[PDB]
From a paper:
The Pden_5119 protein oxidizes NADH with oxygen under mediation by the bound flavin mononucleotide (FMN) and may be involved in the maintenance of the cellular redox pool. The findings so far indicate that the Pden_5119 protein shares functional properties with both flavin reductases, which use flavin as a dissociable cosubstrate, and flavoprotein oxidases, which contain flavin as a permanently bound cofactor. It follows a sequentially ordered mechanism where FMN binds before NADH and the binary complex enzyme-reduced flavin formed after the hydride transfer persists for a long enough time to be oxidized by molecular oxygen. Structural and kinetic data suggest that His-117 plays a role in the binding and positioning of the isoalloxazine ring of FMN, Lys-82 fixes the nicotinamide ring of NADH to support the proS-hydride transfer, and Arg-116 with its positive charge promotes the reaction between dioxygen and reduced flavin.
In order to understand the structural basis for Pden_5119 catalysis, single crystals of this enzyme were prepared and used to collect diffraction data (resolution range 48.75–3.1 Å). The monomer takes a flavodoxin-like fold with a central β sheet made up of five parallel strands in the order 21345 which is sandwiched between helices 1 and 5 on one side and helices 2, 3, and 4 on the other side. The oligomeric state in solution was analyzed by means of small-angle X-ray scattering (SAXS). Ab initio modeling using the SAXS data obtained at a protein concentration of 1.5 mg·mL−1 (73 μM in monomer) yielded an envelope that has space for the dimer. Therefore, we can conclude that the dimer represents the major species in the solution. Despite co-crystallization and soaking trials, we could not obtain crystals of Pden_5119 containing bound FMN. The FMN molecule position was therefore predicted by in silico docking analysis. Further inspection of the isoalloxazine environment implicated three amino acid residues, His-117, Lys-82, and Arg-116, as potentially involved in catalysis. The imidazole ring of His-117 is positioned to form a hydrogen bond with the N3 nitrogen of FMN similar to the case for homologous His-112 and His-116 residues in SsuE and EmoB.
Author numbering: 1 to 50, 56 to 148, 152 to 178, 190 to 193
Write the structure that this text describes.
């Protein structure tokens, strides 16, 4: 087990979205630090309110087996999207304990940046997941499309993955 298996999920269904560039520029820092062959999938390659033999090659089975998770959503209506939460509503309630999650979010401006603490961290603390100390809200300043002071926040948030894996990564029941 020399390399972690990373998955990526972005809650933007559109093809050339700015959320898919954020989740693609997340594993490369981990893959290039330590990892192999990240599963990066957009929510267009999903079963979005259609389990029954769908594209659960690229949603469910890669998500639950991953050693590291990066999760992202466009900020719609002061919170994440609905199609993002429909994917989360299908997870078993205790399925992601001991799992590192990196929170990310894209929006219109620099406003609405309490979605990391008040919207995404309560949902992934419901799963009792190892939420990292650095979630990152980005504005529409990116054109691995990135720009200033979000790249250093992203590179230093993936550095919090390998900092709880040292010496060869050392009433309810599922």
């Amino acid at each position: 087990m020399p390399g972690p298996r990373i998955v990526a999920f972005a809650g933007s269904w559109s093809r050339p979205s700015k959320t898919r560039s954020l989740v693609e520029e997340a594993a490369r820092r981990a893959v290039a630090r330590f990892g192999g062959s990240a599963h990066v999938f957009d929510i267009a390659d999903l079963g979005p309110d259609f389990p029954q033999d769908g594209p659960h090659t690229r949603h469910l089975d890669a998500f639950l087996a991953a050693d590291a998770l990066i999760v992202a959503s466009p900020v719609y209506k002061g919170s994440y999207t609905g199609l993002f939460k429909h994917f989360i509503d299908l997870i078993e309630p205790v399925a992601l304990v001991g799992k590192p999650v990196l929170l990310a979010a894209t929006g219109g401006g620099d406003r609405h940046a309490l979605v990391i603490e008040h919207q995404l961290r309560p949902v992934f603390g419901f799963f009792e997941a190892h939420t990292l100390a650095t979630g990152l809200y980005v504005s529409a300043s990116d054109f691995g499309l990135a720009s200033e002071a979000a790249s250093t926040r992203l590179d230093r948030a993936v550095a919090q993955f390998a900092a709880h894996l040292s010496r060869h990564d050392a009433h309810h029941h599922h």
